[PDB]
From a paper:
[name] is an intrasarcomeric protein filament of vertebrate striated muscle that plays essential roles in sarcomere development, passive mechanics and homeostatic regulation. Despite its large size, [name] has a simple modular structure, primarily consisting of small immunoglobulin (Ig) and fibronectin type III ([name]) domains (ca. 100 residues in length) that account for over 90% of its mass. The C(central)-zone extends along the myosin filament up to the edge of the bare zone and is formed by 11 copies of a long 11-domain tandem unit consisting of [Ig-([name])2-Ig-([name])3-Ig-([name])3].
In order to obtain a domain structure representative of group B and to expand the understanding of [name] domain arraying in [name]’s A-band, we sought to elucidate the crystal structures of the triple [name]-tandems A80-A82 and [name]-[name] (both tandems of type ABC) from the C4 super-repeat, which PaSiMap analysis reveals to be a prototypical representative of [name]’s C-zone. At the domain level, individual [name] components were structurally equivalent in both molecular copies. Regarding overall conformation, the crystal structure of [name]-[name] reveals the poly-Fn tandem chain in an extended arrangement where sequential domains display alternating torsions along the chain path. Domain pairs [name]-A85 and A85-[name] are joined by 3 residue long linkers that are largely hydrophobic in composition, having sequence NPF and DPI, respectively. Direct contacts between domains that could provide stability and rigidity to the tandem conformation are not observed, with steric hindrance between linker groups and neighbouring domains favouring extended arrangements. The copies differ primarily in the opening and rotation angle of the A85-[name] pair, which varies moderately between copies. An analysis of phi and psi dihedral torsion angles of linker residues showed that domain repositioning is singly caused by a small rotation around the psi main chain angle of the proline residue (DPI) in the linker sequence joining both domains. The [N/Y]PF sequence, with its bulky hydrophobic residue components, appears to allow only minor interdomain flexibility as revealed by a comparison of the two molecular copies of [name]-[name] in this study.
Numbering used by the authors: 3 to 306
């Protein structure tokens, strides 16, 4: 048919790479070229307050254009026209875009730390950005890796909204290392360095004091003591008890057992000085160590 100028560029204008000084536009060719091929495109800009369109590039041989010399804080709208041998077609106008610098993802956090461990769980804790640089952190992603495993795995879906997570579902006696990432509106940070490997196992602690230490009977040179298992065994097996004596005139706590201890809740302390006055301490032994002493009630006079 008869020939004329091209149709408008097609499609939504797509704006990308927006900073405070530049941005990038892309469009698609017009559906109709008017009967002659499109020679070049014309890209124009107009700050929203202004009336005059200003030329960005009058000879764009591309479906994209890099706009520069933009000005921080100003809002712009952009225009694209197709040109052929018979003239300039109707424009394709973009949506308004403000020249802002983009938001940035947070910095990689510092390495997390494990605190409380069971055979199946670990509490992991980490720090906020030391200073509130405008990260605007929304939450965290905690990852774990088994020492006998290949890849890092998430300990949870979506985000952790605090500085801590009790990670469960851990395999007893496996060793795990942790790393944490921080996410803001811009996206996910690079991960932190890893924690040191920790083994999933129940901790053991020194035992508590022996229970109900008491005197049973007294002779001319001996004292009979008795007690019961400590209420708190330290998650560990009581393997023995240490008994100590003190002369109240002297004040030096001497031993009444080998350091190994005694495997009974009773003892007969013998060869004690007659009519002297004593105090007695009893201690429990774990694989972890010797726990707190329990003092026998009052001082005792060795008599009959």
């Amino acid at each position: 048919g008869a020939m004329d100028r091209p149709g408008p560029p097609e499609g939504p204008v797509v704006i990308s790479g927006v900073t405070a000084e530049k941005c990038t536009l892309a469009w698609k060719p017009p559906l109709q070229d008017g009967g002659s091929d499109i020679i070049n495109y014309i890209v124009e800009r107009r700050e929203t307050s202004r009336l005059v369109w200003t030329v960005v590039d009058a000879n764009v041989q591309t479906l994209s254009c890099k706009v520069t010399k933009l000005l921080e804080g100003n809002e712009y709208t952009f225009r694209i026209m197709a040109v052929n041998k018979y003239g300039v077609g109707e424009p394709l106008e973009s949506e308004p875009v403000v020249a802002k610098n983009p938001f940035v993802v947070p910095d990689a956090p510092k390495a997390p730390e494990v605190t409380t461990v069971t055979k199946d769980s670990m509490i992991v804790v980490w720090e906020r950005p030391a200073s509130d640089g405008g990260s605007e952190i929304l939450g965290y992603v905690l990852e774990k890796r088994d020492k006998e495993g290949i890849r890092w795995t998430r300990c949870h879906k979506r985000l952790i909204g605090e500085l801590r997570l009790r990670v469960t579902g851990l395999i007893e006696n496996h060793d795990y290392e942790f790393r944490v990432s921080a996410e803001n509106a811009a996206g996910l940070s690079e991960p932190s360095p890893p924690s040191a490997y920790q083994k999933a196992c129940d901790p053991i602690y020194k035992p508590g004091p022996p229970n109900n230490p008491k005197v049973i009977d007294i002779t001319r040179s001996s004292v009979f003591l008795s007690w019961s298992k400590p209420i708190y065994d330290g998650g560990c097996e009581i393997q023995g008890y240490i008994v100590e004596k003190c002369d109240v005139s002297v004040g030096e706590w001497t031993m009444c057992t080998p350091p190994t201890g005694i495997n009974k809740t009773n003892i007969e302390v013998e060869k004690l000085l007659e009519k002297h006055e004593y105090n007695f301490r009893i201690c429990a032994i774990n694989k972890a160590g010797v726990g707190e002493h329990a003092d026998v009630p009052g001082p005792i006079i060795v008599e009959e």
